[PDB]
């Protein structure tokens, strides 16, 4: 049990330095030692990797490693990301050494000769490293070929295949932080928000809010994070399309009263011009009539639990601004007229 800690952390240090350009002192001995250690970890993962204290100990070690590093400053080093990557650690190491230009000639030769010995060893009991890399090359080729011959960006994002993949990764990555309980998930998400591209991230959150559970604590965390952070939710509802927000809001009733409140504030900063029969905003970043109509139409074309909510929120905002029944006076009368 304790024997595996010094094995795994040492291997992780060796792995992390694998990608780094200090390779001068390396030799066949170092490479042989690396790959036999990696075989040992891949053997552990097979033997007693499931349903024991050892699995959870290794997960504690891995996730504690990935949060003590954090991903700030001195190095945004990946590391082996999770316990499943224990079963293919050797492949990571080999790939990193093949990408390191700074590798020495004899090390390179010994490496590649140990990865790809040839068909001298066509008969093997354990799925070896050569087969693993071949299967990887096939998959990478398959992915390229499907992406550029048959794939289409589906408009119903929740049914897309990229967004669904990113989403499942995010959910798994939140589950591990939850089990760790070291730092709160909201801090990870806030750091992500600064770090990576916002437009992409928001579509991904939207999509992860709708994937059914597989262990919905993941979605349960993101709703709390969003309701806590108003600024992101201002761009959440603003950037995405209509039906996605509608399905999100119908799935999570806690997002409904704020969303209508966001829309209710965007109408109020419009002004009607008599010459062109169109509501418009003063500032350029004020939502147009067409987009706002689309949002309310999607909300009305929804389950009954939300239809009455939006309808009452519109009537109460109409009567608040004079209970007119004629256009040119109230954006809310004009909405309710256009819905029918």
């Amino acid at each position: 049990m304790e024997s595996l800690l010094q094995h795994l952390d040492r291997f992780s240090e060796l792995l992390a330095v694998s990608s780094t350009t200090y390779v001068s002192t390396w030799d066949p001995a170092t490479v042989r030692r690396a790959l036999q250690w990696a075989r040992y970890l891949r053997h552990i993962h097979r033997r007693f990797g499931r349903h024991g204290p050892i699995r959870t100990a290794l997960e504690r070690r891995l996730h504690n490693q990935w949060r003590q590093e954090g991903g700030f400053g001195r190095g945004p080093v990946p590391g082996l990301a999770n316990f499943q990557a224990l079963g293919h650690c050797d492949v990571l190491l080999s790939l990193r050494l093949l990408e390191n230009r700074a590798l020495g000639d004899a090390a390179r030769y010994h490496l590649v000769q140990q990865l790809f010995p040839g068909p001298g060893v066509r008969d093997a009991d354990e799925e070896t490293l050569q087969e693993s890399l071949a299967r990887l090359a096939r998959r990478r080729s398959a992915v390229h070929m499907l992406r550029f011959n048959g794939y289409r960006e589906n408009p119903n994002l929740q049914e897309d295949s990229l967004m669904k993949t990113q989403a499942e990764l995010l959910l798994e990555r939140l589950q591990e932080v939850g089990k760790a309980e070291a730092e709160r998930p909201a801090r990870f998400l806030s750091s992500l928000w600064e770090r990576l591209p916002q437009n992409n991230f928001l579509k991904v959150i939207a999509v992860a809010l709708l994937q059914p559970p597989l262990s919905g604590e993941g979605s349960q965390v993101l709703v709390h994070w969003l309701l806590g952070n108003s600024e992101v939710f201002a761009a959440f509802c603003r950037a995405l399309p209509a039906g996605l927000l509608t399905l999100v809001t119908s799935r999570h009733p806690a997002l409904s009263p704020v969303y209508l409140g966001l829309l209710t504030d965007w109408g109020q900063r419009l002004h009607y011009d008599l010459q062109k029969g169109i509501w418009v905003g003063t500032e350029s970043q004020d939502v147009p009539w067409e987009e706002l109509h689309n949002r309310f139409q999607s909300l009305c074309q929804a389950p009954p639990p939300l239809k009455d909510k939006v309808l009452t929120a519109l009537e109460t905002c109409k009567a608040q601004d004079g209970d007119f029944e004629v256009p040119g006076l109230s954006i809310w009368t004009d909405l309710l007229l256009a819905l029918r």
Binding site: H271, L274, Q275, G277, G322, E325, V326, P327, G328, L329
Partner: protein, 142 residues
Amino acid sequence: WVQLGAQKVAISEFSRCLELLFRATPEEKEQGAAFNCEQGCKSDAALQQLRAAALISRGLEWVASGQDTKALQDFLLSVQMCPGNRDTYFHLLQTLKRLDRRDEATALWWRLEAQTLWSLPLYLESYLSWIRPSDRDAFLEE
């Protein structure tokens, strides 16, 4: 309805008039389908004077209700529409003298003196003579 004291339904009717005035053309002489008014219910002068009339009659109700910004929008639009009636300018400048006197007022004074009846219908002539205030020129030389 104004003379009977009903702000809401008054503004309703003025808004209905305005919608029909901007979202439709009376001078649709594409298809000669009937008997029609040759002169009275075609004149662009009648159209602009009538636009202005309805804008003013709406703005005065906004003033009564305490919505001077909307009133300003209507009066400004009437000035943009018919710059040679001066009832527009009187109402607009009274509002600007209430809210933000100096610069905008003089900016429109200069417009008036840059500017300085043909064949209108009588229902429009008489409507304007009814709504206009007696203290127009007295206020406009102030």
